[PDB]
Ligand binder design. Sequence first.
Ligand SMILES: *[C@@H]1O[C@H](CO)[C@@H](O[C@@H]2O[C@H](CO)[C@@H](O[C@@H]3O[C@H](CO[C@H]4O[C@H](CO[C@H]5O[C@H](CO)[C@@H](O)[C@H](O)[C@@H]5O[C@H]5O[C@H](CO)[C@@H](O)[C@H](O)[C@@H]5O)[C@@H](O)[C@H](O[C@H]5O[C@H](CO)[C@@H](O)[C@H](O)[C@@H]5O)[C@@H]4O)[C@@H](O)[C@H](O[C@H]4O[C@H](CO)[C@@H](O)[C@H](O)[C@@H]4O[C@@H]4O[C@H](CO)[C@@H](O)[C@H](O)[C@@H]4O[C@@H]4O[C@H](CO)[C@@H](O)[C@H](O)[C@@H]4O)[C@@H]3O)[C@H](O)[C@H]2NC(C)=O)[C@H](O)[C@H]1NC(C)=O
Ligand SMILES: *[C@@H]1O[C@H](CO)[C@@H](O[C@@H]2O[C@H](CO)[C@@H](O[C@@H]3O[C@H](CO[C@H]4O[C@H](CO)[C@@H](O)[C@H](O[C@H]5O[C@H](CO)[C@@H](O)[C@H](O)[C@@H]5O)[C@@H]4O)[C@@H](O)[C@H](O[C@H]4O[C@H](CO)[C@@H](O)[C@H](O)[C@@H]4O)[C@@H]3O)[C@H](O)[C@H]2NC(C)=O)[C@H](O)[C@H]1NC(C)=O
Ligand SMILES: *[C@@H]1O[C@H](CO)[C@@H](O[C@@H]2O[C@H](CO)[C@@H](O)[C@H](O)[C@H]2NC(C)=O)[C@H](O)[C@H]1NC(C)=O
Ligand SMILES: *[C@@H]1O[C@H](CO)[C@@H](O[C@@H]2O[C@H](CO)[C@@H](O)[C@H](O)[C@H]2NC(C)=O)[C@H](O)[C@H]1NC(C)=O
Ligand SMILES: *[C@@H]1O[C@H](CO)[C@@H](O)[C@H](O)[C@H]1NC(C)=O
Ligand SMILES: CCCCCCCCCC
Lengths: 336, 329, 331, 120, 331, 331
Amino acid sequence: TTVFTRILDRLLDGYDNRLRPGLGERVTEVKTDIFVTSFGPVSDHDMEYTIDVFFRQSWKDERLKFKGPMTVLRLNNLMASKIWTPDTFFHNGKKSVAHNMTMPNKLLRITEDGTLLYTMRLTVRAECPMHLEDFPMDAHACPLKFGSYAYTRAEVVYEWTREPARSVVVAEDGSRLNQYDLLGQTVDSGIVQSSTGEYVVMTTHFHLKRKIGYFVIQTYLPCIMTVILSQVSFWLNRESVPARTVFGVTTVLTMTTLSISARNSLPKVAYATAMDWFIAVCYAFVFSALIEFATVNYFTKRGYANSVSKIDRLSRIAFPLLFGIFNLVYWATYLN
Amino acid sequence: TVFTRILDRLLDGYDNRLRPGLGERVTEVKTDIFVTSFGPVSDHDMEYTIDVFFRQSWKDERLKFKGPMTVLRLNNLMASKIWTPDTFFHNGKKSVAHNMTMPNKLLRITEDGTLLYTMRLTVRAECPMHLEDFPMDAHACPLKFGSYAYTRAEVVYEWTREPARSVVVAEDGSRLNQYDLLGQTVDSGIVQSSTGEYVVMTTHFHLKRKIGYFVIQTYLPCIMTVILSQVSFWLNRESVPARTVFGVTTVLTMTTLSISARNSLPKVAYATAMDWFIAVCYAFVFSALIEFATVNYFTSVSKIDRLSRIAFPLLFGIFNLVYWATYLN
Amino acid sequence: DVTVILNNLLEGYDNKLRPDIGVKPTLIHTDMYVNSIGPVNAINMEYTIDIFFAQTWYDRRLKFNSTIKVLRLNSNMVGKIWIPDTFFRNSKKADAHWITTPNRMLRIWNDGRVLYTLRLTIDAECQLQLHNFPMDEHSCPLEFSSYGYPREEIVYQWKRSSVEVGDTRSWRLYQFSFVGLRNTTEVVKTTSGDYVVMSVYFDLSRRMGYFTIQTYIPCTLIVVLSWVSFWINKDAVPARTSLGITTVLTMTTLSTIARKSLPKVSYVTAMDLFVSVCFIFVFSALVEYGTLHYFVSNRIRIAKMDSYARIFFPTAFCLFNLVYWVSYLYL
Amino acid sequence: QVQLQESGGGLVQSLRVSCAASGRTFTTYIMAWFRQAPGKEREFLAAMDQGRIQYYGDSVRGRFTISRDYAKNSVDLQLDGLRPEDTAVYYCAAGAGFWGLRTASSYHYWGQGTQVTVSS
Amino acid sequence: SFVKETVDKLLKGYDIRLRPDFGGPPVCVGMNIDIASIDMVSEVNMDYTLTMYFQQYWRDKRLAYSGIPLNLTLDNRVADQLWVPDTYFLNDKKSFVHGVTVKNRMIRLHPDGTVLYGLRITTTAACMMDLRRYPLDEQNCTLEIESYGYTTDDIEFYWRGGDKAVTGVERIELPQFSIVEHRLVSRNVVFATGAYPRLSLSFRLKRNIGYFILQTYMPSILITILSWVSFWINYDASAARVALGITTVLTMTTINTHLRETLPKIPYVKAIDMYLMGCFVFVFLALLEYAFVNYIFFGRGTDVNAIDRWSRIVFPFTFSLFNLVYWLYYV
Amino acid sequence: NMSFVKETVDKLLKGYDIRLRPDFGGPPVCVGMNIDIASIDMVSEVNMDYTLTMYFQQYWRDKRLAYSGIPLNLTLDNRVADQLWVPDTYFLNDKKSFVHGVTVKNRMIRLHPDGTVLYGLRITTTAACMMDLRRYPLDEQNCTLEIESYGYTTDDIEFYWRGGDKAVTGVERIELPQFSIVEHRLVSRNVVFATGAYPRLSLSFRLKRNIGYFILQTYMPSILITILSWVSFWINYDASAARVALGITTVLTMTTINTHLRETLPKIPYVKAIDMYLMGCFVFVFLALLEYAFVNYIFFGRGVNAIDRWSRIVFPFTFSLFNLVYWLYYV
Ligand SMILES: *[C@@H]1O[C@H](CO)[C@@H](O[C@@H]2O[C@H](CO)[C@@H](O[C@@H]3O[C@H](CO[C@H]4O[C@H](CO[C@H]5O[C@H](CO)[C@@H](O)[C@H](O)[C@@H]5O[C@H]5O[C@H](CO)[C@@H](O)[C@H](O)[C@@H]5O)[C@@H](O)[C@H](O[C@H]5O[C@H](CO)[C@@H](O)[C@H](O)[C@@H]5O)[C@@H]4O)[C@@H](O)[C@H](O[C@H]4O[C@H](CO)[C@@H](O)[C@H](O)[C@@H]4O[C@@H]4O[C@H](CO)[C@@H](O)[C@H](O)[C@@H]4O[C@@H]4O[C@H](CO)[C@@H](O)[C@H](O)[C@@H]4O)[C@@H]3O)[C@H](O)[C@H]2NC(C)=O)[C@H](O)[C@H]1NC(C)=O
Ligand SMILES: *[C@@H]1O[C@H](CO)[C@@H](O[C@@H]2O[C@H](CO)[C@@H](O[C@@H]3O[C@H](CO[C@H]4O[C@H](CO)[C@@H](O)[C@H](O[C@H]5O[C@H](CO)[C@@H](O)[C@H](O)[C@@H]5O)[C@@H]4O)[C@@H](O)[C@H](O[C@H]4O[C@H](CO)[C@@H](O)[C@H](O)[C@@H]4O)[C@@H]3O)[C@H](O)[C@H]2NC(C)=O)[C@H](O)[C@H]1NC(C)=O
Ligand SMILES: *[C@@H]1O[C@H](CO)[C@@H](O[C@@H]2O[C@H](CO)[C@@H](O)[C@H](O)[C@H]2NC(C)=O)[C@H](O)[C@H]1NC(C)=O
Ligand SMILES: *[C@@H]1O[C@H](CO)[C@@H](O[C@@H]2O[C@H](CO)[C@@H](O)[C@H](O)[C@H]2NC(C)=O)[C@H](O)[C@H]1NC(C)=O
Ligand SMILES: *[C@@H]1O[C@H](CO)[C@@H](O)[C@H](O)[C@H]1NC(C)=O
Ligand SMILES: CCCCCCCCCC
């Protein structure tokens, strides 16, 4: 009983928590791996994605060797604060949370060899730059970079516990994505230089592809159908001036409502997204069709029903054809 | 070394649980404020942000000291071990004392014993509003502060300089998007409650809303829509499809404006001044369409059409000389 | 002098044990001063309140013999003596205040009586029954009780000046208007034991000025407007149909505003019924013309339908209004 | 037109090879590097994303230095410790590195390429 | 007096770094939850928030005392000097313990050594939601409880009272959903290293369809019905039928776009989008039908009235059939 | 060896007072800084503030901590910062800032053999940047970040940019959504008061807003609508149904564009450049409809192709002139 108590007390006697193990003697080596409980939601407005991890870390400290009937200990969180631990921080974590409900979600295991094992549970809002030119047919690779903050390359080196591919595990329930689809993750490590010195950075990229089914029904189909709706007015007789005029103008008012709502879903940007061009082209066809009727109306001598105007015959073919051509160029470009 | 000793000797035998001159006199606190930036005013929450430099100076005979030094600059950690007034803001809601990169505080002690406690805060205060004259309304957002646990017979608050010049709005300290700070008024008074009587220092920041935005966005489109409805009186009575479609669409247009206009306005049960203007505009567009139905049911230009070319523009013209004159004056 | 007295009180005092432990319950007299009731967030079923909570009890361990009768302490001496663990049961999120110091008071008399006041900002939880919206009333509660102590250890009791208000017009109630206030005491049984719960009820009633102008008048005008097609000549087919359909577009636009400031409840509120019925009234106006036009052209019933609609529809709408308002305003 | 041009290089027994990018802004794109041996394969050399993170190939790790002038939108590759085995056409590629940044197909834009002859 | 002596003795020599029965059998930790309320069930974030009176019971023999038949309720601060299980909620994104007026927490020692430790947590659990059938969907939101730093050889979890462990579920009112039932699970997660005890709490929220009937389906049905009126108008009335036809298309777009702005942003095809898109086709075909009719009569001047006669049957028939398939598919 | 380094640290910290600046009574302690920006986001015109994250660093020399015999640069644990003296540097226009704490409080302390100390931080601050949006969206905002000592004058402390013009890095790598950083400047100056000069360092960017978004969303829709309103002038005045319906719908269409853009655009209640254009277009469509009302009356009430003919040129001419004035003035 009291034997275990005595072992813990002797460990901190003379141990210094301000000096990394093997200071001025060798390079402290930290072996780490990540378990992803749930890849959190991805926000386009803030361009940041949440993630919950079980962040593990292993390293060897020669100052914590001990001998006794036990082999592996499980220190209290109070004692875990008196032991040097790597200052791992996330290079793009905008606002991360270390849960401590109902107790600090930390676990410090020490072996008689001195090979500390250190796991914790985190929620991270890592930032993710995005290029939304091909909206909504794009595909990003949101990264995750963590490395030491104070210790340079010549002091602390980070390595993955196993092969880098198998050192990040994603739970099958991990995907909390409504609009994206986690294809896979890429794991690699690199070197960064800054104002203070070199560092070792462990990078993980989570590939994401945006689902497109929502936009086709919400925006692409109504826009395509509305343009067809306007182009159908060319089959009305040229003498129905009050009809085609109301037909032509109200279609513009319809497309205006569609364009406005569609951009509300699209996050606030400044460049020209792929969807904005499609809406703009539709907006041009609807405008073009109405102008066509004005040209026809300027040559209608008799207001009572003459034959079909030659412009009407040509517009029945040219207008549906050009829009049909535009769809090929639009979809082939962004789906190859 | 000598400087190190002097600081340590002060707190020897000093108790921070007792106000200066306990049982001997009334502690006198002199305050002044430097408003770096009068932060945004939010109509929806009836509150306004403000960042200040709260200076407080009192006298404490227990900290008298002599030596080569004249004015000290104590560490904030030591500042925690010295009695300080518990000044709090009565209408404060969520105040942040900045901690980056260090606790934004400062305690200085002169050889006389007088302290100078200065700190930087971001204060959100309750500013009750009466939007019955929106958007032509004016406001007086206050900011009261006094002691909490000490009655008026223990701690008294005074403005360090003269009251008109103990609060100094910064030269560029106006982050008001819509309002326009006319000037502040500074006064002190006495407030009594259940636990005793207290001394309260007030400050009223008179604000005036800028009507320029609303004229373009709401008033002009509504006036122009109303005029469009009155246009149909000049169309001939025979063209029934033209005048009927004209009447209804404007009603739809007027409905669209009234919906969007209230989105900006914070939701208040009592009807504002603007909402009365829109409804009158709504009444005119609706009355114009009813006028045609009277004409068509009774079928030269019809006398009803000729009469309403004068009555409707005149009545709407009069209604503006009543609405604008009343609220502006 | 005062320093000596304080040192005597703290010495030999254990703050883990309530006064008179193992003898009798610790009677506590409470009070409140509602500074300002914040906005009533109907979507989340909560309302914000700011108060100055005050409590009073006895503690023989803190008696001192001196000419001084009061020791007005501050926000660095609370943790030394025993403090009741009062919490607000129906509170979603509550915060004390700390600027520029913790807004707390602690006065100790020479006979042991202790006063302990503090300032709080509480986001209490209130259940709203929006059936009669926007002609509804609510009594939002505010309950608090000792957390760990049952009724055999801590007993709450209102003081004579139980609940107080400041300037009522300075409250942030944009929509509702405060009308009344009740304070009740009751006993509640839980798994740990039976506690003593103190409740304060703030009766709130909504003001209908905003909605009358925003919804009830524009809807009523449109329903009136659709009746115009009855007086239009039946040969103006483009005129009657365009007038008929556009009102439906207008009425559809207004139906957006009905569900804009209230949670997505799944029952027909009073507002929903009125807007829905107005939709059908303008809807039936166009169907009536469609029936009339078919029999005139495509095929004594025809003349009657044009004449009957001028009378029945206004009468049908008037009776519905007569029923609707009496069903809510009067009942 | 978005043309990725690579300068420098030549015949040498310490070589700095740059890659100026025109027609597109790659401030938030990985301006990587690649080498193509004659007939063998295409091999990864280096990369540098927005956050200045430098990646290197284990074959020649510690021999090649990669630098990007974010202002000029250009990536400069340094060749040190040259060996006769390094005689191959070097290619500069840019892209988002989808499905990993060490795969050639991950980069949309590609450079013309420059051949460097090494003899000893 | 006597109580002060016994309490001090219990904590004397107590070591919070050792669980009770360090070398003996695993300590039984019987939990029990008293849910207070559920709110902010958000489909956008796929989460929900609930406030609960989480409580834990375990037997530690180091705190046994004799001669005091009173269940001592120590101050909430004493918990920092005792061993408590490292229980954490596996699927929470954010949580806290309310601390007004003090940190909500209780410790109730018992003469036999039984220790009761209760908190009051407003956590935000993570719930994966499948919204394809939205708004006719039944979500299943859980709450996982696990020991962070122990195996079944040291700690064990079990609900206290079995199916009665969780209380207050039936008294929860949600604006939209309806808690059909809840279940309790006591399973051990078995891995290569060992077994980790786990408890599960899970309800089955059923969305209420009433809100969507009045705001979404009825306007969609009524507008579509109106578009069919143009099949009864004369085919020569080009102005009216086009104006009636096109305005219905615009009206549907107003309904469709407005819902997207108010309904939660869930960017994939749901059961509500298919209906709205379904109706928008019917009104589109209604106007397109006339354009075919007008072209046949004038451009090529079967019977022109026949197409209108035929469409008066097929269109209401098809839309009725479409609704029949839709409702039965999702119900 | 390693224990000797422990002795060296214990030598420095022992006897070190954190209340004394280096060279307490002598020359001022120069402090060099070099920010290292990481990202910028949340540039909100609604609150006139922006948020950036930086690796803020400060260099200064303290002769009280120099060590000998160790050719390395000691990198002590970040918790040692509580036992050193650091400048009381604060940002003068920050609304909310914090130091990231995951997984440990991000800061570094590095001691060089000559006593030089480097003290880095990873700070994310929501600095306030007052904006002048009278030319929005053709605006060029200038945002700063004022850095100043709190309780020291230039007699005691002196800030300077370490590394000169290269003190701030990572600016170009930033990618704002709807802006384009053009340049940044470094200012090192002393704010002079009555007491004495206060050192200040200013970092200031020059943001420029992109226009591609508003071209395809505001200007193009409004120009296309206005051109449509001119079609009325090529339709015979006798077409009362067609011209009125075309004219009024555009007026409705412009209103739809204005209101919906207002909700999309940030709420900045004062006149901007976009508002003048939208209001400018609204007048042109209003006059187009009003033009027909004058044509119809003259032909009928006072009964005239000239007025329509003369308007076929003036309206395109005037609107082109309006654009020429607008674009030149705002560019
Ligand atoms: C899981 O993780 C979460 C975090 O994610 C974690 O939550 C944290 O929980 C701890 C407790 O375990 C909290 O810390 C306590 O906070 C108590 C009150 O909190 C309010 O005030 C905080 C600051 O208080 C300072 O300022 C006031 C006013 O000036 C002053 O009276 C205080 O003494 C204190 O002064 C110190 O600090 C200031 C700077 O803050 C210095 O300027 C000053 O010089 C001095 O050093 C504040 O930080 C809190 O903000 C949080 O919460 C609010 C919501 O409430 C939220 O809005 C914020 O964003 C933020 O989250 C909050 O406003 C505080 O009273 C506690 O200190 C007590 O108790 C501890 C117990 O160990 C004791 O050690 C202290 O000495 C002190 O003793 C008290 O002090 C009383 C007040 O003075 C006094 O009346 C009593 O008599 C008693 O004794 C005194 O002691 C002082 C000091 O020695 C002495 O001078 C007197 O003479 C006398 O002897 C404690 O700080 C922490 O805030 C929580 N953080 C968060 C983010 O939630 C949770 O615990 C984790 N769980 C587990 C299991 O680990
Ligand atoms: C929301 O969705 C979740 C997930 O689906 C629902 O949660 C599930 O609820 C069901 C019903 O309550 C759970 O099934 C029960 O599981 C317990 C626990 O089983 C474990 O522990 C046992 C301990 O003795 C052990 O014997 C079990 O081993 C069996 O199962 C494993 C596989 O899991 C298998 O490998 C073994 O060979 C065994 O067959 C296991 O480790 C179990 O005790 C229950 O058994 C009762 O019911 C069965 C019914 O057939 C009956 O035969 C038994 O005699 C006994 O009466 C039962 O299987 C399920 O585990 C839960 N899912 C998870 C992930 O925990 C939740 O209910 C949903 N919400 C709502 C509101 O419903
Ligand atoms: C102390 O607490 C224990 C445990 O709750 C009490 O014992 C239970 O009391 C309840 C209520 O009277 C009974 O229904 C149970 O049958 C009791 N169980 C046992 C094992 O005795 C005990 O009564 C409490 N003591 C006091 C003085 O309140
Ligand atoms: C400790 O830090 C100093 C300062 O950064 C290092 O000195 C630099 O060394 C590099 C490499 O030789 C030079 O390019 C710089 O010019 C030096 N700067 C100064 C100010 O001297 C020093 O090398 C570091 N110590 C160790 C062991 O690397
Ligand atoms: C409310 O408080 C008063 C004291 O102010 C008390 O007399 C009254 O009985 C209380 N109400 C009830 C229902 O007990
Ligand atoms: C109540 C609806 C009135 C519509 C116009 C009626 C005119 C009647 C003239 C005698």
